[PDB]
RNA sequence: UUUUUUUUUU
RNA sequence: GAGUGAUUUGUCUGGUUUAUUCCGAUAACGAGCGAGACUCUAGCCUCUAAAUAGUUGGCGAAUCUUCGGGUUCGUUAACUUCUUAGAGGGAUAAGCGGUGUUUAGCCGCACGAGAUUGAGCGAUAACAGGUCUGUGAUGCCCUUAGAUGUCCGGGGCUGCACGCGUGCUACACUGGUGGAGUCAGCGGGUCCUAUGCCGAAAGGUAUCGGUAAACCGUUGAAAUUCUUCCAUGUCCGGGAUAGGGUAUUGUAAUUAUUGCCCUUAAACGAGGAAUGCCUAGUAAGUGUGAGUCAUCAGCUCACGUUGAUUACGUCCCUGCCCUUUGUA
């Protein structure tokens, strides 16, 4: 059970998925002293400044090639 | 400047969005404080223009589905009006606040994609979009071949969704997606 | 005789508002603003008055004549013509400061109150029932 | 299973209408019909009587919906 | 009464009053069906190449 | 009296040329001339199938002919009409005079 | 605006009398489902099993006189000149060989 | 899209080479100049030429 | 200052009051077949209200207050969509006998005149008087 | 992951 | 230029563009077609004009009035805001920020009515694609009066165990039924038909006006809005099938032309495997006009009214374009 972590989107890496439906983005944790910045895959239209709510924050998306 | 009240009855300035992520995607107050949820505007010229549409107008827009009811925005606005009256008369608080809480609680926070599936996060805009879609879909199903009117069904769906109770259609579907997504981690 | 004449448009509906010096009257096709169908779209006609203040309308007689289009389009044309008529009156017989204030309130609330929406129906093209949709294709 | 729903008020249901229903926060023909197993037409006919007698307040009186509340 | 091909002989009974002559000389033959042929149905359109 | 000049044409340029010539003639003769009144143009549309058979994609040819009509009102009982009407003339424009 | 159960028996008797004698109570002849009967010439409203009896008699009359409509009726085909190639199929698909 | 065709580009180059003095860095001035300096059969074409001429002036100022 | 003409009141209330006045006057002779007919081909059942004639005449007078017309025009005014069963709906005019008889009764009560140009019916000198009186009675 | 065929002459 | 030659290069490494669109590099130089430009169309706005378009008044008249006003016709001046239709302007990547090879350009902002409105046209080279049943376009073949010419009378092209395609109507309370109340546009007419009278309707009858911004026609459309009853019942959903009567078109209605009235009231309870169309005034719903038309629209071609959900991506499926590569 990982705490609900809020993370703001710092930049948009670009589209991904079989049909190009997901968006790979870089997120930075909001309430974090170290400012954990990781890469995530997002469903739906996302832009810079959007705050995502990760149910679990340990997972990391494979960087786009 | 006079305070703008939806339908001239409900105040908008006393509405707050709990979800920080959805604060800027649920337009209620300030520039979005509109007397009627029927404003003939262009919210699809660019990508995120729909994010500026008032949330009540989005509800009215999504309630006019199943082509039988396609284009009847006046009927849909009346339906939302009566549903809001029922909401206030049944719960006690601002029906706009009830709708906002339902939208906050009805949007999934993790979903699945075909990249077997892969669990992914949900952008705030899609989280709001699905919230409205699930709520309207729940009301529509409950009122089909049922004595309960659409306004009564809509009122019940919003109330249960706002409370988070697992009797609303939207909450059940929201939990279904998250549970399935949690498997595809 | 202090009088101005403006117009509003929407789809095909067009409304012409003649606003003269008067005792605070607003009549659309000779009918009051409180008995214009559809009922639900009456706050749309009242919106200019609600935002600006009835006190800035009670000094004029605005007679509006609308034609073309449908009910909703005519309601929008009428409200646009009302707003533009008040602005034109305050521009031609009241101070530019008040005219600027009026424009500021109207634009802050709704841009369509002053500027016409340029959307019009797109022509149907053969091979389909409408502008974009096409007749069902059978491949066998 | 079919809704064996009565077309006119049995005496017991009639008394129930004056005792219980008047206390409901939300009063509508559909809810009273689902409660007392009465045709919705009867439900709103009886609610008109309740309004005339002054035991309920009308909040919405649309042709597509009627809503009453406890007084 | 001519039916298009032959003259159908018919006695006029009193019960035929108020009707047309053509109603008593059918112009076609009642259909009795015949074991559908090749073209019918989508499965039976294929002819082997060799 | 009101002489009505009806000039009709399928091409705008010759029609307006003739109309301007008549207006100039009337003004030169110092007549009471009523400016060119432009009647709404009449559009005749024929939409046909392009193919001479029934085969192919269903494509349609949209033909249309336009007719423009101009009205000129004159208060001229003198024979200045004869002159102004006779001098100006152009193919493709048909003019008619009425004693309204 | 009354439910049929709240009616007494003489109400039904009155209504039935009117139904069996509509002409008496100023119901015009154009309101009836059997006007100028081909056999009797009387104009009345057929009720209850009379409708089925008259349908039987009509079909029997046409079949006996060998009218085209009656022949089609007892063959079981459509009688109002509709296309029967594609619609009205209430049978079983028949295959090829 | 917003890519200027060789027609517009060549016309702009000839105009700049032949009337450098009259071409300022203002679109309206360039448009008015073109109206009398060249015979262009289309107002959109003339405006495209004038706009590209202004864009070329901005670079000419910076360098060759 | 307001509510001095039919145009200043609610048209539904205006027609209701006019029908009440016509019924009370006791001078309108209803056709014998009033309880026997439909009000146009597009309708399936006869009118639910047994006093539909008075309401129809009230509506006719109210509309005559707005524009002159004839029997043919009123047939379209009261016409509507006809459902052709398994084929698409189409516009259908209403019946003409009821309209004609109602207008003749309105003439009998000296409420409707013939057009001075002889091309329709116009609300009469007394008709305008009575209708304005009903409107100002509605007042509020 | 699976994915075999296409008569003769012209 | 390169190859004996078929053939290449020009017609590109790269960047960019909806684009062989441009920038640029370059054994090629200079050109053409196509694209673009262009024509029509939609905006938004200023000069010309309007007894076939209208307003603002002035003047008569007649209603109400809370007495201060409202509504209404019938008409002689001022003016074109509205209407019409000519002539023009207006937007262009032009201004600001970022980015890019000092480019081509791209993103965002501002200004603005608008920062890609929709169509038309549309190359080289082809297909044994369709059309001899459009043609006084046509070769060859056949036939030419016991005709395959032409006309006349009947019938058929609709015939029904069945399979498929395009569709219309529905399965219902976001509804149906009776009222009440109201808003179009494209366009048509010698045939449209106003308006009186009769008729329950269908329709009948006397005819006005119009060959038309003049009359039909202020084109009183539907969906939609407000009310009344109905309430989850195949029922007031649905109106297939069938009986009787009845108008109208036409020489003629049988194999029911179509419409009207009463009656009968079927399947259908949201539709399997599959599969179509679609990105904003669009989809969908909704009606209207025109073509066909003596009569007959569930079809097509257009027009408006009400009016959204989703996305602003990708090459995963289906394909397309360019380059390299392999090929029996």
Curated annotation (Swiss-Prot), chain A:
Superkingdom of this protein's organism: Eukaryota
Location(s) in or outside the cell: Cytoplasm, Cytosol; Cytoplasm; Rough endoplasmic reticulum
Record-level GO cellular component terms: cytoplasmic side of rough endoplasmic reticulum membrane; cytosolic small ribosomal subunit; ribosome
PROSITE patterns reported for this sequence: RIBOSOMAL_S28E (PS00961)
InterPro entries assigned: NA-bd_OB-fold, Ribosomal_eS28, Ribosomal_eS28_CS
Pfam families: Ribosomal_S28e (PF01200)
GO-annotated molecular function: structural constituent of ribosome
Subunit description: Component of the 40S small ribosomal subunit.
Entry protein name: Small ribosomal subunit protein eS28
UniProtKB/Swiss-Prot annotation, chain C:
Family of the protein in this entry: Belongs to the universal ribosomal protein uS9 family.
Name this protein carries in UniProt: Small ribosomal subunit protein uS9
Keyword Endoplasmic reticulum applies: no
InterPro entries: Ribosomal_Su5_D2-typ_SF, Ribosomal_uS9, Ribosomal_uS9_CS, Ribsml_uS5_D2-typ_fold_subgr
GO biological process, any: maturation of SSU-rRNA from tricistronic rRNA transcript (SSU-rRNA, 5.8S rRNA, LSU-rRNA)
Species: Caenorhabditis elegans
One GO cellular component, as annotated: cytosolic small ribosomal subunit
PANTHER family: RIBOSOMAL PROTEIN S16 (PTHR21569:SF16), RIBOSOMAL PROTEIN S9 (PTHR21569)
Region (Disordered): 120-140
Pfam family, one: Ribosomal_S9
GO molecular function: RNA binding; structural constituent of ribosome
Keywords carried by this UniProt record: Acetylation, Ribonucleoprotein, Ribosomal protein
Swiss-Prot record, chain E:
Superkingdom per UniProt: Eukaryota
Function according to Swiss-Prot or TrEMBL: Negatively regulates lifespan.
Entry similarity comment: Belongs to the universal ribosomal protein uS19 family.
Protein name from the UniProt record: Small ribosomal subunit protein uS19
Name of the coding gene: rps-15
UniProtKB/Swiss-Prot annotation, chain H:
Domain of life: Eukaryota
Protein family: Belongs to the eukaryotic ribosomal protein eS17 family.
Protein name as catalogued: Small ribosomal subunit protein eS17
Originating organism: Caenorhabditis elegans
Gene name of this polypeptide: rps-17
């Amino acid at each position: 059970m990982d705490k609900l972590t809020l993370a703001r989107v710092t930049k948009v890496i670009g589209r991904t998925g079989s049909q190009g439906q997901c968006t790979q983005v870089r997120v930075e944790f909001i309430n974090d002293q170290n400012n954990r910045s990781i890469i995530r895959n997002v469903k739906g239209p996302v832009r810079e400044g959007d705050i995502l709510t990760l149910l679990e924050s340990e997972r990391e998306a494979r960087r786009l090639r | 400047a006079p305070e703008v009240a939806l339908f001239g009855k409900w105040s908008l300035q006393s509405v707050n969005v709990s979800d920080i992520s959805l604060v800027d995607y649920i337009p209620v107050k300030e520039k979005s404080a509109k007397y009627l949820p029927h404003s003939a505007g262009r919210f699809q010229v660019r990508r995120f223009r729909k994010a500026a549409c008032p949330i009540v107008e989005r509800l009215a827009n999504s309630l006019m589905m199943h082509g039988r009811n396609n284009g009847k925005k006046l009927m849909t606005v009346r339906i939302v009006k009566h549903a809001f009256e029922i909401i206030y008369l049944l719960t006690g608080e601002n029906p706009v606040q009830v709708l906002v809480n339902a939208v906050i609680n009805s949007g999934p926070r993790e979903d699945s994609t075909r990249i077997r599936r892969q669990a992914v996060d949900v952008a705030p805009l899609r989280r709001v979009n699905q919230a409205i879609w699930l709520l309207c879909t729940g009301a529509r199903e409950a009122a089909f071949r049922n004595v309960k009117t659409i306004a009564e069904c809509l009122a019940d769906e919003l109330i249960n969704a706002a409370k988070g109770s697992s009797n609303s259609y939207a909450i059940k579907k929201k939990d279904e997606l998250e549970r399935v997504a949690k498997s595809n981690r | 005789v202090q009088s101005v004449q403006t117009f509003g448009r929407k789809k095909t509906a067009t409304a012409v508002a003649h606003c003269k010096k008067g005792q605070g009257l607003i009549k659309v096709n000779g009918r009051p603003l409180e008995f214009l169908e559809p009922q639900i779209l009456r706050i749309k006609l009242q919106e200019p008055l609600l935002l600006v203040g009835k006190e800035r309308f009670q000094d004029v007689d605005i007679r509006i004549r609308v034609s073309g289009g449908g009910h909703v389009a005519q309601i929008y044309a009428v409200r646009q013509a009302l707003a533009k008529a008040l602005v034109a009156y305050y521009h031609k017989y009241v101070d530019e400061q008040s005219k600027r204030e009026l424009k500021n309130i109207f634009a802050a609330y709704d841009k369509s109150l002053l500027v016409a929406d340029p959307r019009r129906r797109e022509s149907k093209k053969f091979g389909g029932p409408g502008a974009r949709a096409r007749y069902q294709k059978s491949y066998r | 299973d079919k809704l064996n729903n009565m077309v006119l008020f049995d005496q017991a249901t009639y008394d129930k209408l004056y005792k219980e229903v008047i206390t409901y926060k939300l009063i509508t023909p559909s809810v009273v019909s689902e409660r007392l197993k009465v045709r919705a037409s009867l439900a709103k006919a009886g609610l008109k009587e309740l309004q005339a007698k002054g035991l309920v307040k009308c909040v919405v009186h649309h042709h597509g919906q009627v809503v009453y509340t406890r007084a | 009464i001519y039916n298009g091909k032959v003259f159908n002989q018919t006695e006029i009974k009193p019960e035929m009053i108020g009707f047309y002559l053509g109603e008593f000389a059918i112009s076609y033959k009642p259909v009795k069906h015949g074991r559908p042929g090749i073209g019918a149905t989508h499965s039976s359109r294929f002819i082997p190449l060799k | 009296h009101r002489i009505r000049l009806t000039l009709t044409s399928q091409n705008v340029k010759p029609l307006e040329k003739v109309c301007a010539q008549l207006i100039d003639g009337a003004k030169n003769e110092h007549l009471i001339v009523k400016g060119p009144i432009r009647m709404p143009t009449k559009v005749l549309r024929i939409t046909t199938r392009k193919t001479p058979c029934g085969e192919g994609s269903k494509t349609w040819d949209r033909f249309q002919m336009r007719i423009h009509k101009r009205l000129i009102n004159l208060h001229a009982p003198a024979e200045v009409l004869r002159q102004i009407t006779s001098i100006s003339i152009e193919p493709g424009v048909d003019i008619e005079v009425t004693r309204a | 605006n009354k439910r049929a159960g709240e009616l007494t028996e003489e109400d039904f008797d009155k209504i039935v009398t009117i139904m069996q004698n509509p002409s008496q109570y100023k119901i015009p002849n154009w309101f009836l489902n059997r006007q100028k009967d081909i056999k009797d010439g009387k104009t009345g409203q057929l009720l209850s099993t009379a409708v089925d009896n008259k349908l039987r008699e009509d079909l029997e009359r046409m079949k006996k006189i060998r009218l085209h409509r009656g022949l089609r009726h007892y063959w079981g085909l459509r009688v109002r000149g509709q296309h029967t190639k594609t619609t009205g199929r209430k049978g079983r698909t028949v295959g090829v060989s | 899209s917003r890519v200027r065709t060789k027609t517009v580009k060549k016309a702009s180059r000839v105009l700049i080479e032949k009337y450098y003095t009259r071409m300022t860095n203002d679109f309206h001035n360039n448009k008015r100049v073109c109206d009398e300096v060249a015979i262009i059969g289309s107002k959109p074409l003339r405006n495209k030429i004038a706009g590209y001429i202004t864009h070329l002036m901005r670079r000419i100022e910076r360098g060759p | 200052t307001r509510a001095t003409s039919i145009k200043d009141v609610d048209q539904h209330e205006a027609t209701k009051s006019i029908a009440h006045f016509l019924k009370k006057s006791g001078k309108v002779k209803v056709p014998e077949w009033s309880d026997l007919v439909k009000l146009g081909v597009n309708k399936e059942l006869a009118p639910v209200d047994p006093d539909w004639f008075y309401t129809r005449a009230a509506s006719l007078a109210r509309h005559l207050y707005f524009r002159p017309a004839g029997i043919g025009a009123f047939k379209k005014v009261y016409g509507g969509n006809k459902r052709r069963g398994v084929a698409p709906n189409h516009f259908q005019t209403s019946a003409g006998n009821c309209l004609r008889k109602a207008v003749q009764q309105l003439e009998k009560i000296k409420w409707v005149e013939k057009h001075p140009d002889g091309k329709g019916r116009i609300l009469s000198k007394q008709g305008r008087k009575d209708l304005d009186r009903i409107a100002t009675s509605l007042r509020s």
